[PDB]
Symmetry: C3
Subunit: 221 residues, 3 copies
Amino acid sequence: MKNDLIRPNVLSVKIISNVSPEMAKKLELEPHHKSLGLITADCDDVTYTALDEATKAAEVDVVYARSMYAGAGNASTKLAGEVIGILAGPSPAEVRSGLNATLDFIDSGVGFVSANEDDSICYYAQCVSRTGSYLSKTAGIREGEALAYLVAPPLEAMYALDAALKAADVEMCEFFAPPTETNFAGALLTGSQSACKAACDAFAEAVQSVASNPLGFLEHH
Amino acid sequence: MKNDLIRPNVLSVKIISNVSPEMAKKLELEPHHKSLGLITADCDDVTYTALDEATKAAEVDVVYARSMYAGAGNASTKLAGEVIGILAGPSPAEVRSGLNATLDFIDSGVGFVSANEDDSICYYAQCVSRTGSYLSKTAGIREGEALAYLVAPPLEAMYALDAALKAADVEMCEFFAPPTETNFAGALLTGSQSACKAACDAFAEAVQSVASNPLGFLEHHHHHH
Amino acid sequence: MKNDLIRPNVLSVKIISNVSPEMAKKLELEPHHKSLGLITADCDDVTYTALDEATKAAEVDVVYARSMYAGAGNASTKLAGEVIGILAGPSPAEVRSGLNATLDFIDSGVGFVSANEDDSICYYAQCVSRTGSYLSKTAGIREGEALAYLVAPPLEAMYALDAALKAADVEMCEFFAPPTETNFAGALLTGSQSACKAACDAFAEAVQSVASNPLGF
Ligand code: NA
Ligand code: NA
Ligand code: NA
């Protein structure tokens, strides 16, 4: 029902202890990337946020992070989910530490939230108070600056992004043009922690507004 | 069943007044674009045709038009359908007028056509007798010129496109290489109205022919294997 | 169940004779490509292997070969499957020969193998002893060289490629970065036929290992 958290789930986790040079080449790794941590889950944006959190907790870089076509509900195999993430670090111990931080964050209460009675519309509106080394780079901001991480289905996202931008003192960083692989859309916006939180609140409100009135457009503008 | 029209459905429609400069930039809008009309539906090519109609009815441009991966039957949320379209105009009034024209066209009786008993194969063979700004620009022809808008699943489409091109005095404008996001394929062909209709007729016939006998090759040529 | 072969199925086959100039141009055909053989199936990598085999069996080139988004189980129509392949040649006779060879190979016993009780995890580990003109190009290697053709779901594939590369003297020529259109991953590896076989065996074992213990790290 509306405002319920949709629980994200990790499906598989593995460590490669001493990456082969052939694999290092195709993943475009640097020489100090000796060990890899592999993870899949059924929620991509939560996992991306968690991978970024891991870079704050351990000496790991996010070296690979991609979503699956048509989302976790359409996975054809058990462990594909809708995301694969790869952390790289100097040793198995450090990669293990990073993976543990990733897992803890995924299970921490973050997640997409339902906008209606049967949870057929959902969105993500997460305030990242202090970015790690992954989301800061992707957003084009200094490490440690804040983001509003906003995701919703295509129309809801475009409508709600506009609402968030008008409501909150933030700047556009990365635009997720619809469709992403999972057929969602959204953006990373930056500003003060306060402004990012305001953007999240306005985004959530606007997505809920569309869910409650999906075809309505005739009112005075 | 075969030859049934598959009804297309609009899922969501909204307007953005005074688009933010941040969004205007990411959508690569013209400076005079001040308002946006957003629409989603469960059938992409009908919606694209409808958005083209909108550009004839009101002062709007189609500035965004994308299909969803694996089509409407695989949507994971209620309003995603398989298409998002965005109209841009100088005012909410114009965008409103454009959206109303889009909606009316989608519910005008157009749609994909079934090629078999359980509607598990379908195709689109629409003669656009008078293109608006959107499809004419997409096809590289003059506004008002005609198109054959031909869509089918990958193999049917390749087979039927060849049939359509042979049957009619038309020219290739845009090729939809398989897969599009929805795992279909096809093309926009241009020519006289009668030529575009002949291309549509031939395309439809060829798609139905494949649906009726997709593996006739096996008996005719793969015997004794 | 585990180690079961997942049968690959062909869904449609058609020929085009005297391809129209307009289609020839959009498909980037060569002047001698007058005829096309079209095929769809519910298993892309088996089909790609079969199309390559066809180039050794007939005077045909693989001119088009693409997978469908989200795989055959998510097809919205009956004949889309998860792959379309197009062979081109000088005559209907040659493209029919090429299609016949493609069909024979698809039915030869090759295919994805299940790694668990409900076949919810599967993989492809096929040694191609002698490449034809299609997989040699995609791999960026010399025609006639051997390949290991390795495919699995994303994490399993990354884990098992590591195991494969360590198991024998092979190079990774083409990386199928996750996701492919079907949400799988893997690679073409090359080396001696014996090394490629060793890589296939190591890949298969590693995928099975992950399936038996998905969360153990
Ligand atoms: Na603002
Ligand atoms: Na002609
Ligand atoms: Na599905």
